[PDB]
Amino acid sequence: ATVAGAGKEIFADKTFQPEPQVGESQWNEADATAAGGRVLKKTTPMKP
């Protein structure tokens, strides 16, 4: 944020931004509030 008007909140890109690999990175968690994830629509059949 140059003058706090710029540098606004950067949001997740709808294509790939929430990635499957990333996450919390230590056993002693923090258990934050806002959490996001990916999920498959109902059309795609289920397989393990």
Partner: protein, 49 residues
């Protein structure tokens, strides 16, 4: 009281391992550092020709 703990001081030191994840650059142990991870050094086999 139902728990008694004996507190002592030791010469803690790791002779062959190094940290693979250090939560912060600082010393002065705090709750955040209760989960750092170690891993062993690579082997070396110095010997005559």
């Amino acid at each position: 009281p139902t728990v008694v703990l004996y507190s002592e001081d030791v010469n803690m030191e790791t002779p062959d391992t190094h940290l693979s994840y250090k939560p912060k650059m600082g010393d002065k142990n705090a709750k955040v550092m209760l989960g750092q991870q170690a891993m062993p050094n690579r082997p070396n086999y110095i010997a005559f020709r």
